[PDB]
Amino acid sequence: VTRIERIGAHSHIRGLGLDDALEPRQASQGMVGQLAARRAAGVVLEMIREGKIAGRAVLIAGQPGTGKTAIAMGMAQALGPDTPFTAIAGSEIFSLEMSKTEALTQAFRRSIGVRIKEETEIIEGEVVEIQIDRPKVGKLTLKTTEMETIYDLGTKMIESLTDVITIDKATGKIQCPDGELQKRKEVVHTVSLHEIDVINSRTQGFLALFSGDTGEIKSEVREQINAKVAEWREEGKAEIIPGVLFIDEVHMLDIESFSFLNRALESDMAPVLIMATNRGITRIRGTSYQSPHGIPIDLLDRLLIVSTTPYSEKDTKQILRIRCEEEDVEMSEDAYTVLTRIGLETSLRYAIQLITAASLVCRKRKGTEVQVDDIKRVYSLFLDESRSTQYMKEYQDAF
Amino acid sequence: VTRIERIGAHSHIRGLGLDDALEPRQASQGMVGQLAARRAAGVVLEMIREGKIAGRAVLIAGQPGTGKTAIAMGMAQALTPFTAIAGSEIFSLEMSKTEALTQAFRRSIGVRIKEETEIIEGEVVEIQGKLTLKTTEMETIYDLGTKMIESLTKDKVQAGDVITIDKATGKISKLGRSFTRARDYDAMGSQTKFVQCPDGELQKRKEVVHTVSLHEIDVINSRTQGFLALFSGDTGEIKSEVREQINAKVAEWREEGKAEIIPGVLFIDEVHMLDIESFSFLNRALESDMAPVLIMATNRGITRIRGTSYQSPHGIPIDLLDRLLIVSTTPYSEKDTKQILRIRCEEEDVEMSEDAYTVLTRIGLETSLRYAIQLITAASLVCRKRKGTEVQVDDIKRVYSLFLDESRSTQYMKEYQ
Amino acid sequence: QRIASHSHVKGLGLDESGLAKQAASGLVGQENAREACGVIVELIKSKKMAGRAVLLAGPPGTGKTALALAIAQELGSKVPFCPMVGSEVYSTEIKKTEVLMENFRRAIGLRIKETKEVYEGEVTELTPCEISHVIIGLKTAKGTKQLKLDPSIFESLQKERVEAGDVIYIEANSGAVKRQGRCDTYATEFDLEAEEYVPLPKGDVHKKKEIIQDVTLHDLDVANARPQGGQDILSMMGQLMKPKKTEITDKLRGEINKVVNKYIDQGIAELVPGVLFVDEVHMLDIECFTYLHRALESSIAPIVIFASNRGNCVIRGTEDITSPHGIPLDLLDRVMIIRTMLYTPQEMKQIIKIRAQTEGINISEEALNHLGEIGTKTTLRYSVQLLTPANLLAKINGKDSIEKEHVEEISELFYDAKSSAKILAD
Amino acid sequence: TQRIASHSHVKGLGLDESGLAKQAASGLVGQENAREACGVIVELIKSKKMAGRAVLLAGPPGTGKTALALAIAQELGSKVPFCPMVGSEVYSTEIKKTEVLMENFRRAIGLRIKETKEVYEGEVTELTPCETENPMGGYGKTISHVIIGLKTAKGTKQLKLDPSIFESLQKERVEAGDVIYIEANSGAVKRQGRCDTYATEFDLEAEEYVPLPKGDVHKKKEIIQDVTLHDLDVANARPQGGQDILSMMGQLMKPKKTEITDKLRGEINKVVNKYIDQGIAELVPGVLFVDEVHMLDIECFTYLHRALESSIAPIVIFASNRGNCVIRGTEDITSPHGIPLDLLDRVMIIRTMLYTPQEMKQIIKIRAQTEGINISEEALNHLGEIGTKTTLRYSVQLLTPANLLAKINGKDSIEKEHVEEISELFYDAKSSAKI
Amino acid sequence: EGEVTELTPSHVIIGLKTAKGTKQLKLDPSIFESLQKERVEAGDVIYIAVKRQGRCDTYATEFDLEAEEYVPLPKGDVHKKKEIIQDVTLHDLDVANARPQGGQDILSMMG
Amino acid sequence: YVAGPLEYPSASLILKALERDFWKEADLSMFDLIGLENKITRHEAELLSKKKIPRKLQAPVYGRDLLRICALPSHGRVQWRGSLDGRRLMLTLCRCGESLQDVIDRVAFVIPPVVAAPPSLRVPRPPPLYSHRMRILR
Ligand SMILES: Nc1ncnc2c1ncn2[C@@H]1O[C@H](COP(=O)(O)OP(=O)(O)O)[C@@H](O)[C@H]1O
């Protein structure tokens, strides 16, 4: 019953609420407000889907709690599978086994996909206790419900016959399956430029699933792989698909990372870099230069800014009702009004915390529907950030 | 034909042009001006050649572009191990500053080792239990022991192979058959290349001299030696293995004459960037017996010492300044500037007019000298574009208008982006 | 083609006389910097000088990187061109100086001329005689013969699991590989063996062709930084640090240079010095600038192009020393500085039109005027970025070209650095 | 190659029989009180009664602190180990500072280990005298003794060894005519190789023929091996013998100098004490001369003033050259000599005054003598005057270049003109400060 | 589990004997034991992915003094399947799949 | 717990991403690692014993063959192999605080923990397996 993907904060959103003409809606796909920002998100999503342009970046600015990451997650969901979406934070680049610049340029590798189609022949069959052990060509009783083929094979194939014997181009591999044994299966695999790492050394897929690999071989395995995958393109071998790289709280990047991104977005296979920041006028990390959003101007000019206005009472209560639908909480209109007030006063995330605590208290007191007294007792029990700040007068081990 | 090394920034100086009595000439081996600095360079070069003492350091001071690096490269070319490095090269992530600096010091010293061993070489006629080794002037049969029999099989020795075997049963099949190559018409193995049959006495003792630097500590560092001698090698370099073993072995070889040391020179360009730790280490390292002659270069005056808030002359501690012989250079004059520009034009295969030389010297006096050194080739290329046979004033003026100098660049920065 | 930020730049735009055209080869205006670029490109093509430096200094968004890419295109793929960034020097397993030296070495290339021939032959004819002499048969679609090989080739062959009816390639000097099947493996109707087959090769039994492989000194260094494999030294597992910490110059790089010079004198190899374009030079530390102004003085250093976007500021790693272009006066001198000037509104509109033509976007007259106005308002890059979503919305709304309404709407939707800072005061 | 170093004239403290100081103190001049303190501390070291004691050679630059340090070191002699270290060497990127300090302390301590082994060697003539079967059991064929006819260069001596060793004889290729290496207690046979007398010039083989042994068959080889405690630590640290250690990739990174206290102390100390009190070894504590001690971080001094508290710590000779300066690694914490005030209380300060101009002249003259170049009276006086003006170390460096200038000018002795010319060709930092 | 009665060999046809009965298992070569694991009289317990030589069979009467210690014949059937409800954390599986230590290929052991 | 291996499905062209055309890989004789099989003395000996061009031991084909076979042996070099060979107590410890005990017993007594859930190794599953990679792995 209980799955890994339990109910989360950004779980209610399951898409972007836009029309055919990218026209936002009042309430759809878990999206309530941010009409202009939602339309911008849809525009950039359609641009990414086009894939004809490369080396573009976008920044989602706005105050904390104004749907900054919600719009990004909605764009990711609307993008759907089959397109890489590397979601990371500004603190991930700070790795030890690899340099921050190398970590970033590898994250870029995780944002560009490539589809490859393989046409192979796979034979049917069933295990009937073939290839007995100790106790020549041998015997192979290949048979299917539709048609049977009782024939033998060489010595290097009788020892690999064994419930469903799915012989393929490899040295064999494992009710009787139906249909002709000879069947053409066209399988398509999508990798995020894994060739740079999957061909780094011997037994290197081990590294691809371990990250133990140190800084890749600069300008020796990344450019050759790019040239080879380009040769594949235009020849019917493979085609590359651009993904998205989402760096939440990008202000943690340093001047080095910004200077590297300045030119990383100027390549043929440069993915669309969407970013988000809550800080305003703040010193760029590693220096004392104060710039907006903590990002230098030479990079902010290379991207498009997307502002997210704050939510109102209507949008606040609508998002609260959407979260209720996501969860299993139910309350009365008076409770809705009280929660909307508390949220518009303090914050929306704190309001969601309070409504969760109120549903829990209701479940504890055997109640069926949360009421005003429940949320009041909750607010009394769980204090707010600003509320606790007022009580800081106690001087609890100051600096 | 273009080669690896070509005309560069310090290729015009073929050496430290000096007389027999260390009397600096006006300009002989491409170098001009800096008479006192040239004589000091010659004196320190003679000191290096003498090798009578150890642990001597010389500091080359002067303003930027005064030929300090030029004098250093001239001394190096006239000087025979030489190691040129910068303050940033010793800074290594996997090796502490002290370890890298010690490695550089030991690599700046050379050591010649004479090796004499008995060698037996000749064409193999037939084996077996016993060998029948042939040479141009004679042939001999040898009885093979168990070790020799095993080596004859682990390596596919056969008739015609020009084998070689010294003592310690160290057999070698250097190259393949001589005459039999005929019937190998189409394909020829990778290692099975052919050689001429040796001549002279079958068994002969050969004396060879092996030249290696004192940095051989890496060879005796780990189980595998040749591997670490190519890349960074080992980073530890335990003090024991360095001093108690290598130094004592070199001393014993010197006593018995098996080896002889030749102290080189360690040129650390731009020493001002070194940390106080490196200077404190040098203070002692220059006191050791097998210490090479150190040369430095710095463009700093009263500047802060990296790693501390203290300021001292040349940006280095006073503790070390009392251990160096400062050789300050003098800025070039009109005549010296014109002469070095003439030398640069002659080396770069560039012909310019007298008025062109005058304008170039005026520019090099109003601006840096390297600016004019670059304007030389720039105007040469402009003239080539115009298809002219000689560079005129128009070309140098066009280049001066195209490429900006530090002064004009800073003056035109009023935009402030 | 996935148009990039510098795709329309397919050249430098110099005429036969050397002067820079007003607008050609994708570039617009900037005649002085283009002339300097066309002079330094000839300097590079001369292949006689070494270590000469260049600095494409100028305000942001002036096309210094565009000029660098134009130089790279004009030079052609026959000479190496290493695009480099300052942040890349901050490696974790290699010291900054060593990364810089590796980039310098990569910026030098050499072409290896060689004439290799093959001796493809049939395995079914394998008939050794004496292990001392072996014979293999030849059967191709154009001829049939036989060859005689050294027993070493027979050993290297039997090392592989050769089988009757396979196609094996035998090089005249060394090496051998197997290709299974020659239109006989699928005939017997035996199932697959984890490998794909191939028909018999066409052409003569013995082939010879001229080979030219473009290899750079850094490849030689990396190859010589390992035991090359072979015996038990071939031990290689995951996490292997192929980009090893460092490699000494006197005994490893020196030997590479010596062998390259030897093979060049023999006429087998041909050197082709490349270019090292280091972008965001101001990001390098002072301990990097001090080694850079010395390494570029060597007789082997190639041409290095620099580009400093920001102006005078504190140098990295110093926190007290301030120099113009964020580069110390030591390295600033000896580097030819090429000042890049700002673009005029007409030049901005022309660049916008060229970008629209290259990317396929079609803009109207009034639309182009409005886009150029929005660009000169804040910066040209903002208009270049808005150009695409304008046509995207036009297509969404059913319009083929961009109009004033679409450009105005997309400008109001998104925001630029100036507009963002204006509203950020809240 | 003599390879004269910077300051090699120092040969010892040169103290009289009474312990006082003199001028011609075996190369080193002046510094009476300092050389007397050096004599006291070297007498302490020789006593080998106290441990973990530190001494500070505080003094302005040029006072020859390192000179007197090397002097006391030479006086100690090559018998006891002397490990010189500078504060910069403590900064290691692979091993922590305190562990490097402990390794240096271990190196400073010496240990002579003796080893006596009774071994028999010589050309073997194997023969088994047939003996009646085991008398306790039935009858048959047995061997009660095995006689080996070891023949040495001095003569022949048959040994009636135990019969159980016959397995070892058959194990190795011990045939009549080869040299074997017998062991008294163990008895294991290790064939050295055939005798050179049978090495016919026509036989091609090496490492198989060895010369006959010189001396009696019974040889009691006494060998002594002096290895510092750090050597034993390193030897017991890394493994040896199989265990797939032959790998290259995952094992070539030998720099695992990281060390723990459990192995360093404890078992090693106990086995050392067992060898000492048993008569197999003799402990030899040395000295650890640490110059530029002010260069160490406070994290180093805080470990030093704790390691010096141990009973096994050797004698340490600190030599600080700086004065009142902020301790490294601390936020503007000024302390005397750049050393925390807490560590200065645990060290004896040996003050060294500045050299008198007469002492400067003496030093210049003795350095010229060591170099092997004659200097005239006027030239020596000028050298002394310039050494009084600027730092003294500048004058001594003007000898070799002036000597070469004189030799090139056609004269032998260094005339005043030569030093005058060199003073203008080369000058000091005090004059170079005029930027 | 059971005393090894036969160890004749890639695939090894081992024979395990217990109080219930005897079964000749057609075990895979990957389980072939490297150490002593005597062909007879050795008590072994195997599960599918490593073998454990529990102890020597109860032959204490064969010799009066032997280095090997003995355990009684297992009374449980040779082939038995038991369901174990093991509690583990996700990070365990994560770090295990990160650097696995199972299998038998030489590359694994070298890694 | 014995967890199953994580199957990593991937395309086949991935494994063929760094393979270069056989008619484009030139013979790189720049490998200075030949100092593991050649000596400086033997290097000089080979240089001083190179067969001359005549080599007096279909006619034009044989001449071209002789020419190409004379070209290759001219290559000779060595860094160092002779200089390397020309230059060159395991006491018992308790490993713990116990007075005296066999180290084997020490290690055998205290072994509480076993791995939580070790699976087998990961295995890429490209339905096509190129002969080159499989041969190299074998
Ligand atoms: N328009 C909206 N529709 C639905 N849910 C929203 C909307 N805006 C915000 N939310 C929710 O309100 C909270 C806002 O937090 P978020 O915007 O993610 O903060 P930040 O972006 O600063 O990390 C999230 O739980 C988000 O899911």
Ligand SMILES: Nc1ncnc2c1ncn2[C@@H]1O[C@H](COP(=O)(O)OP(=O)(O)O)[C@@H](O)[C@H]1O
């Ligand atoms: N006396 C001289 N003779 C020849 N060339 C000189 C001379 N002085 C300076 N140069 C030239 O000046 C250029 C730069 O000088 P540089 O050596 O960088 O000064 P610094 O010694 O301060 O580093 C060099 O390319 C060199 O060719």
Ligand SMILES: Nc1ncnc2c1ncn2[C@@H]1O[C@H](COP(=O)(O)OP(=O)(O)O)[C@@H](O)[C@H]1O
């Ligand atoms: N002379 C020119 N003609 C046409 N387009 C130009 C010209 N110079 C710059 N551009 C455009 O302006 C943009 C500036 O990019 P870039 O060269 O990175 O600016 P910067 O000068 O900051 O490096 C480029 O994308 C390029 O397409």
Ligand SMILES: Nc1ncnc2c1ncn2[C@@H]1O[C@H](COP(=O)(O)OP(=O)(O)O)[C@@H](O)[C@H]1O
């Ligand atoms: N008393 C002395 N007699 C002779 N030479 C001396 C004397 N004192 C110092 N020197 C000389 O001073 C030089 C260095 O002294 P040093 O021990 O390094 O002092 P510091 O370390 O304080 O500079 C040595 O080369 C030595 O020749």
